[PDB]
Each structure stands twice: as structure tokens, then as C-alpha cells.
Write an enzyme that holds these catalytic residues in place. Structure first.
Site, PDB file in Angstrom:
ATOM      1  N   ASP A   1       0.822  -1.214   0.000  1.00  0.00           N
ATOM      2  CA  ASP A   1       0.000   0.000   0.000  1.00  0.00           C
ATOM      3  C   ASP A   1       0.856   1.264   0.000  1.00  0.00           C
ATOM      4  O   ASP A   1       0.607   2.191   0.759  1.00  0.00           O
ATOM      5  CB  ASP A   1      -0.940  -0.004   1.210  1.00  0.00           C
ATOM      6  CG  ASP A   1      -1.946   1.145   1.184  1.00  0.00           C
ATOM      7  OD1 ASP A   1      -2.342   1.587   0.083  1.00  0.00           O
ATOM      8  OD2 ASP A   1      -2.353   1.599   2.276  1.00  0.00           O
TER       9      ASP A   1
ATOM     10  N   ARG B   1       0.019   9.017   1.330  1.00  0.00           N
ATOM     11  CA  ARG B   1      -0.633   8.970   2.638  1.00  0.00           C
ATOM     12  C   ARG B   1       0.118   8.109   3.640  1.00  0.00           C
ATOM     13  O   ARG B   1      -0.079   8.254   4.838  1.00  0.00           O
ATOM     14  CB  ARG B   1      -2.081   8.467   2.511  1.00  0.00           C
ATOM     15  CG  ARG B   1      -2.241   7.128   1.796  1.00  0.00           C
ATOM     16  CD  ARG B   1      -3.711   6.704   1.732  1.00  0.00           C
ATOM     17  NE  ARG B   1      -4.010   5.832   0.591  1.00  0.00           N
ATOM     18  CZ  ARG B   1      -3.524   4.605   0.421  1.00  0.00           C
ATOM     19  NH1 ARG B   1      -2.700   4.082   1.321  1.00  0.00           N
ATOM     20  NH2 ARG B   1      -3.864   3.900  -0.654  1.00  0.00           N
ATOM     21  N   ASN B   2       0.975   7.217   3.154  1.00  0.00           N
ATOM     22  CA  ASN B   2       1.743   6.352   4.043  1.00  0.00           C
ATOM     23  C   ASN B   2       3.192   6.749   4.166  1.00  0.00           C
ATOM     24  O   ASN B   2       4.033   5.931   4.538  1.00  0.00           O
ATOM     25  CB  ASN B   2       1.657   4.887   3.612  1.00  0.00           C
ATOM     26  CG  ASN B   2       0.424   4.201   4.158  1.00  0.00           C
ATOM     27  OD1 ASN B   2      -0.001   4.483   5.283  1.00  0.00           O
ATOM     28  ND2 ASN B   2      -0.151   3.292   3.376  1.00  0.00           N
TER      29      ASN B   2
ATOM     30  N   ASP C   1       2.845   2.539   7.801  1.00  0.00           N
ATOM     31  CA  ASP C   1       1.668   1.816   7.337  1.00  0.00           C
ATOM     32  C   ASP C   1       0.575   1.935   8.389  1.00  0.00           C
ATOM     33  O   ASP C   1       0.628   1.286   9.427  1.00  0.00           O
ATOM     34  CB  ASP C   1       1.983   0.341   7.071  1.00  0.00           C
ATOM     35  CG  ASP C   1       0.819  -0.390   6.414  1.00  0.00           C
ATOM     36  OD1 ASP C   1       0.964  -1.574   6.060  1.00  0.00           O
ATOM     37  OD2 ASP C   1      -0.250   0.234   6.254  1.00  0.00           O
TER      38      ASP C   1
HETATM   39  C1  LIG Z   1       1.681  13.543  12.831  1.00  0.00           C
HETATM   40  N1  LIG Z   1       2.429  12.278  12.941  1.00  0.00           N
HETATM   41  C2  LIG Z   1       1.660  11.176  12.836  1.00  0.00           C
HETATM   42  O1  LIG Z   1       0.447  11.267  12.679  1.00  0.00           O
HETATM   43  C3  LIG Z   1       2.342   9.888  12.914  1.00  0.00           C
HETATM   44  C4  LIG Z   1       1.557   8.723  12.805  1.00  0.00           C
HETATM   45  C5  LIG Z   1       2.287   7.522  12.994  1.00  0.00           C
HETATM   46  O2  LIG Z   1       1.431   6.456  12.911  1.00  0.00           O
HETATM   47  C6  LIG Z   1       1.865   5.155  12.877  1.00  0.00           C
HETATM   48  C7  LIG Z   1       1.743   4.468  14.159  1.00  0.00           C
HETATM   49  C8  LIG Z   1       2.247   3.117  14.224  1.00  0.00           C
HETATM   50  C9  LIG Z   1       2.804   2.512  13.024  1.00  0.00           C
HETATM   51  O3  LIG Z   1       3.198   1.270  12.855  1.00  0.00           O
HETATM   52  C10 LIG Z   1       3.462   1.209  11.511  1.00  0.00           C
HETATM   53  N2  LIG Z   1       3.934  -0.010  10.900  1.00  0.00           N
HETATM   54  C11 LIG Z   1       4.678  -0.168   9.783  1.00  0.00           C
HETATM   55  C12 LIG Z   1       5.622   0.817   9.271  1.00  0.00           C
HETATM   56  C13 LIG Z   1       6.414   0.531   8.125  1.00  0.00           C
HETATM   57  C14 LIG Z   1       6.217  -0.771   7.562  1.00  0.00           C
HETATM   58 CL1  LIG Z   1       7.160  -1.155   6.182  1.00  0.00          CL
HETATM   59  C15 LIG Z   1       5.296  -1.771   8.072  1.00  0.00           C
HETATM   60  O4  LIG Z   1       5.162  -3.018   7.473  1.00  0.00           O
HETATM   61  C16 LIG Z   1       3.902  -3.679   7.693  1.00  0.00           C
HETATM   62  C17 LIG Z   1       3.974  -5.086   7.109  1.00  0.00           C
HETATM   63  C18 LIG Z   1       5.431  -5.441   6.832  1.00  0.00           C
HETATM   64  C19 LIG Z   1       5.737  -5.364   5.357  1.00  0.00           C
HETATM   65  C20 LIG Z   1       4.417  -5.262   4.616  1.00  0.00           C
HETATM   66  N3  LIG Z   1       3.415  -5.095   5.710  1.00  0.00           N
HETATM   67  C21 LIG Z   1       2.066  -5.664   5.491  1.00  0.00           C
HETATM   68  C22 LIG Z   1       4.496  -1.460   9.221  1.00  0.00           C
HETATM   69  N4  LIG Z   1       3.254   2.365  10.820  1.00  0.00           N
HETATM   70  C23 LIG Z   1       2.850   3.221  11.765  1.00  0.00           C
HETATM   71  C24 LIG Z   1       2.407   4.566  11.651  1.00  0.00           C
HETATM   72  C25 LIG Z   1       3.714   7.455  13.265  1.00  0.00           C
HETATM   73  C26 LIG Z   1       4.437   8.675  13.337  1.00  0.00           C
HETATM   74  N5  LIG Z   1       3.698   9.794  13.153  1.00  0.00           N
END
Ligand SMILES: CNC(=O)c1cc(Oc2ccc3oc(Nc4ccc(Cl)c(OC[C@@H]5CCCN5C)c4)nc3c2)ccn1
Length: 283
Positions: free
Chosen positions: A152, A156-157, A170
């Protein structure tokens, strides 16, 4: 994933050392006391079913397994032991998702700066845009190197932190899906490259929505499969548009690899910087 281990001694964090804040399945802001070596703002992903508990637990294991990289939101800890809900804690990126952020800089853009520079204080420039692209590509090079498939990838990510550092996250999207993903439900590193191509378009349109004015229906997918592609966004350079096209090649094995994208984007970043040094010097 499930077979992966969870080293509690290293990652576990006490639930009472957290103070949950406002909403950002749910991701929320919170204050952590002693998360590192002091109160630090963090982001927390927690459940809002055993199935879902296993999913989150597996996400945690994978992030641990993958390891640290500057361009991947950093894992800081977790609350997994009994006594409260499962919580995954990550760093907090203050500027938020790249799409919204780029959208807000539309009246604060100049291709490059020259004296007097204060005319462009905090403005975005070609250097910023190529740089964000270069960073995400390194992050994806890091994840693909470990057989990881995002599935994804979109503006947005992508999160923006201090000093213009961007991170892949994510929060968990037809417009970001490769033809093989739509029609064959096939997800690979190569379909992630297609998505990256859409991410490039998002960055170089300053946060616009992909395929403007097009209804996403049976015809959208058909024409995509047949070779139709978005036209160049308003702030792209010719090279960046060709890279986008390279990323949207119909044959997955003909698309560039993330390592090739890192190399290419690095070259464009340097050429842009040299051009900028001459613009600055001559005026
Ligand atoms: C204003 N600042 C903010 O709003 C704000 C919001 C935030 O929110 C978050 C909170 C927890 C999270 O945990 C993850 N996981 C996650 C990340 C990268 C990968 Cl590659 C992945 O991989 C998931 C798995 C592994 C590979 C493919 N996938 C299905 C999982 N992303 C996150 C985002 C963080 C910082 N600031």
C-alpha cells in the site's frame, strides 16, 4: 511472522508509562515516559478478535526482524504482556503524511533559490521533491532487500519528520495498484515499484489525487491494462516523468528495481544541486 520471536527484554514497555492522546484498528498520539535513554511524544497502534491480535503481533515481529533504517518509521517498543491491550509504539513524525503536507505548500514553491534567499524561507524546491523521492526509494530498497512487500505504498503512508526526513509507515487503493495486482491479485516487489511510480506523481503534483477526473470503474482498469498512463504532473522535470513511466511498465520484470531507482534518483539529485549552485552563483 508468527514463527518470528519477540524479545521482550529488549522491546517491552510498561503500559502505565504511557498517556494516550488524540487519534491520528487505531493509531493515536501519546506521551511516553522513559521510552528511551524524559517525556517523549510517540505514536501508538492498537486494536479498537484473536485474528486481529495475531495480525498486530505479527506486524510487531516483522518490524523487529526488519531492523532500523532512517527512512522507515522507527519502532520504539510495545506492550504485549497481559494486563492491558496490545500496543505497538513508534516514533512520532510531527509534520504528518506527505500528501497533506505537500498540498499545504502549493503557494510556497519555487524551483530553486537565489539571493535574497529569505524571499523563499521554508519554501519547497525541486531539491526537496527529488530528495523526498530519493529517501523513499532508499527505504523501499531496504525493505525489498529483506523480501518485504509493502502492498500500500502511497503519499498517505509517507510521514515527514524534522529536517526534511521522510519515513515509510503503514496505518493499516485501486489507483496505486499495478495491473497484475488488480487482475491477478499478485503482490510483489515489482508491484510495489508500480506504486512508487504513483507516489512520484503525487510528490511532483504537490499532493494531488492520481488520475484526476477519471472514474475508477471497469474502463479505468481496462485502459490501465492496455497501456494508458497519467500525464506529467505540474512540478515534474522531464527525467522524473520518464522514471514514472519506467515504473509503470506493463511487464513487471521490465520495471526498474529499487536499487536502480536509488542510483538514478541520487544522480538526478546531484545534477539538480549542481544546477542550483550555478543559478545561485550567477545571480
Ligand atoms: C503527525 N504524525 C503522525 O500522525 C504519525 C503517525 C504515525 O502512525 C503510525 C503508528 C504506528 C505505526 O506502525 C506502523 N507499521 C509499519 C511501518 C512501516 C512498515 Cl514497512 C510496516 O510493514 C507492515 C507489514 C510489513 C511489510 C508489509 N506489511 C504488510 C508497518 N506504521 C505506523 C504509523 C507514526 C508517526 N507519526
Amino acid at each position: 511472522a508468527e514463527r518470528l520471536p519477540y524479545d521482550a527484554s529488549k522491546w517491552e514497555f510498561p503500559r502505565d508509562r504511557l498517556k494516550l492522546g488524540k487519534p491520528l484498528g487505531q493509531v493515536i498520539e501519546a506521551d511516553a515516559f522513559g521510552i528511551d535513554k524524559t517525556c517523549r511524544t510517540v505514536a501508538v497502534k492498537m486494536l479498537k478478535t484473536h485474528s486481529e491480535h495475531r495480525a498486530l503481533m505479527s506486524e510487531l515481529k516483522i518490524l523487529i526482524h526488519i531492523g532500523h533504517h532512517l527512512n522507515v518509521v522507527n519502532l520504539l517498543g510495545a506492550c504485549t504482556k497481559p494486563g492491558g491491550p496490545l500496543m505497538v509504539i513508534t516514533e512520532f513524525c510531527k509534520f504528518g503524511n506527505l500528501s497533506t503536507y505537500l498540498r499545504s505548500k502549493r503557494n510556497e514553491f519555487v524551483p530553486y533559490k537565489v539571493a535574497p534567499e529569505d524571499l523563499y524561507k521554508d519554501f519547497l524546491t525541486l531539491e526537496h521533491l527529488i530528495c523526498y523521492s530519493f529517501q523513499v526509494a532508499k527505504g523501499m530498497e531496504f525493505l525489498a532487500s529483506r523480501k518485504c512487500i509493502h502492498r500500500d505504498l502511497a503519499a498517505r503512508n509517507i510521514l515527514l519528520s524534522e529536517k526534511n526526513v521522510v519515513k515509510i509507515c503503514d496505518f493499516g487503493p485501486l489507483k496505486w495498484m499495478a495491473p497484475e495486482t488488480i487482475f491477478d491479485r499478485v503482490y510483489t516487489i515489482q508491484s510495489d515499484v508500480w506504486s512508487f511510480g504513483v507516489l512520484l506523481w503525487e510528490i511532483f503534483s504537490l499532493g494531488a489525487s492520481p488520475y484526476p477526473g477519471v472514474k475508477i470503474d471497469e474502463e479505468f482498469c481496462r485502459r490501465l491494462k492496455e497501456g494508458t498512463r497519467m500525464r506529467a504532473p505540474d512540478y515534474t522535470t522531464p527525467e522524473m516523468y520518464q522514471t514514472m513511466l519506467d515504473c509503470w511498465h506493463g511487464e513487471p520484470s521490465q520495471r526498474p528495481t529499487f536499487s536502480e531507482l536509488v542510483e538514478h534518483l541520487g544522480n538526478l539529485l546531484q545534477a539538480n544541486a549542481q544546477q542550483d549552485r550555478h543559478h545561485h552563483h550567477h545571480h
